[PDB]
Design a protein around this ligand. Structure first.
Ligand SMILES: [Zn+2]
Length: 32
């Protein structure tokens, strides 16, 4: 919640996620 921006938005389920993750947090999609 602090200087952690960079979240990526999905393109299949339409859901944002943290850049520290490996996949989506809604559809479980493989991060690019
Ligand atoms: Zn997704």
């Amino acid at each position: 919640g602090h200087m952690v921006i960079g979240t990526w938005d999905c393109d299949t389920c339409l859901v944002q996620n943290k850049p520290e993750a490996i996949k989506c947090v809604a559809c479980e999609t493989p991060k690019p």
